[PDB]
């Protein structure tokens, strides 16, 4: 019936591939019914099974790539799919540590001579 993507996430891998194989079989039979000339019910139904294929493949690819990134969570060189894909200059930007670290000259200047909190009487 109405397959949906909250009923697919705890589902294990091989029965998801079995569900995918059955939906592929059903799409192929409906295409043969289309070219033979079948019912308007079946010609309706091929959109339902294409989107069924679609959300099963969505659930498979999501649960694959989530496991990939919590496999590569703690590691230092993680693949390029799993790295942050923001814009090119924003990846080539200096990071939050190297823009923060100051030399000993200006940090002793910031120690000795800080900005004060003054107010001038009229």
């Amino acid at each position: 019936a109405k397959i949906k993507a909250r009923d697919l996430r705890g589902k294990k891998k091989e029965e998801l591939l079995k569900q995918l194989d059955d939906l592929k079989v059903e799409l192929s039979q409906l295409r043969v019914a289309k070219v033979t000339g079948g019912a308007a019910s079946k010609l309706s139904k091929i959109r339902v099974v294409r989107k069924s294929i679609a959300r099963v493949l969505t659930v498979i690819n999501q649960t694959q790539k989530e496991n990939l990134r919590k496999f590569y969570k703690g590691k230092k060189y993680k693949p390029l799919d799993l790295r942050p894909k923001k814009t090119r200059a924003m990846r080539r930007r200096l990071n939050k540590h190297e823009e923060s670290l100051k030399t000993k000259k200006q940090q002793r200047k910031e120690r000795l001579y800080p900005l004060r909190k003054y107010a001038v009487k009229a």
């Binding site: 039979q29 070219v35 590569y72």
Partner: protein, 118 residues
């Protein structure tokens, strides 16, 4: 030592194998051209039905990245029937029509009544 030939050649050095510290892309690409997406549907034209009736072939259309080998592997996995030969052409619409001549112990009229085209 001694040199015999008067040409200096490049000394053949050592080249290590790729030992990559992390894979480039994480998941391998899923096979988008597989046994269901390789054949789309069979034809039901009068020429196609006369050919499956007489010459014991089937007339499919496939997508154009197929091989004759991929088409016969696909039909052998999808309908469990052995395939003698495959003749492909590209129609003027642009799909790749394929002609799947079966092994002579199978009969394509029975296969067509099995898979719906009649």
């Amino acid at each position: 030592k001694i040199r015999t030939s008067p040409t200096f050649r490049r000394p053949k050095t050592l080249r290590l194998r790729r030992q990559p510290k992390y894979p480039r892309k994480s998941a391998p690409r899923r096979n988008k051209l597989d046994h269901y997406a390789i054949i789309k549907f069979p034809l039901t034209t009068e020429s196609a039905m006369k050919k499956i009736e007489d010459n014991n072939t089937l007339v499919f259309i496939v997508d154009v990245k197929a091989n004759k080998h991929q088409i016969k592997q696909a039909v052998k996995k999808l309908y469990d029937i052995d395939v003698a030969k495959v003749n492909t052409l590209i129609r003027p619409d642009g799909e790749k029509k394929a002609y799947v001549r079966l092994a002579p112990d199978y009969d394509a009229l029975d296969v067509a009544n099995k898979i719906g085209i009649i």
